[PDB]
Symmetry: C2
Subunit: 132 residues, 2 copies
């Protein structure tokens, strides 16, 4: 069983992703948040296997949260509306294992979580096509 914390400011996606991931037999959403501070606080206290975060959030950003959680054993998957090529390097240095676009199929999300748990790095193909 994979324990997942989800930090997303847009409540409709937060609740919809939480419902989606909970239907998986090997996944459990153990907590939900709306700010980067919520992610830092939960991860440091509860130590989930995976943290799914929006790159942009009020208070502390998903990126600032990722950097603060760099030395925890938690696997960070970043969600972004835009490819944000200029912010991707900061995410790599932060130790982000997954970097996904909100235009990616929802089916690939559970697969990304499982891949990241198997020590693989999952990046949006659009970001390679954008960066190169």
């Amino acid at each position: 069983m994979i324990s997942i914390f989800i930090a997303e400011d847009q409540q409709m996606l937060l609740g919809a992703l939480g419902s989606l991931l909970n239907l998986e037999d090997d996944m459990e959403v153990v907590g939900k948040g709306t700010t980067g501070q919520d992610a830092v606080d939960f991860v440091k206290k509860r130590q989930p296997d995976v943290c799914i975060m929006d790159i942009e959030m009020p208070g502390k950003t998903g990126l600032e949260a990722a950097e603060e959680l760099k030395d925890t054993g938690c696997k960070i998957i970043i969600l972004t509306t835009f490819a944000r090529p200029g912010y991707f390097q900061r995410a790599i240095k932060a130790g982000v294992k997954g970097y996904l676009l909100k235009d990616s199929p929802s089916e690939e999300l559970a697969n990304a979580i499982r891949s990241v748990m198997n020590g693989k790095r999952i990046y949006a193909p659009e970001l390679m096509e954008d960066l190169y």
Copy 2:
């Protein structure tokens, strides 16, 4: 509590698939189709005639707003989804019954569909910002 057929038109595929999954769990609802453009919504609604169409106001090709205006005299009840004024008035004139923000709780969505089906106007309380 007759079954409600829903079509979802959303360009961000992760929200499209996640919303489709969430609404399908409801006993009185069925997601009969999914689309990524405004033309997909116009084409689906005109051919398959769903009870409700959930649309993102901004989409590639034809927008959710242009689609809503084209589908004004159909029978289909439009609920608009938006991330972010003049676009709200254009929706009311187009006959849009529902106007929700992506920052609204996902639980408001099923309830909105049911309310719109009962002839009510649903505008997200979150919309009244400042």
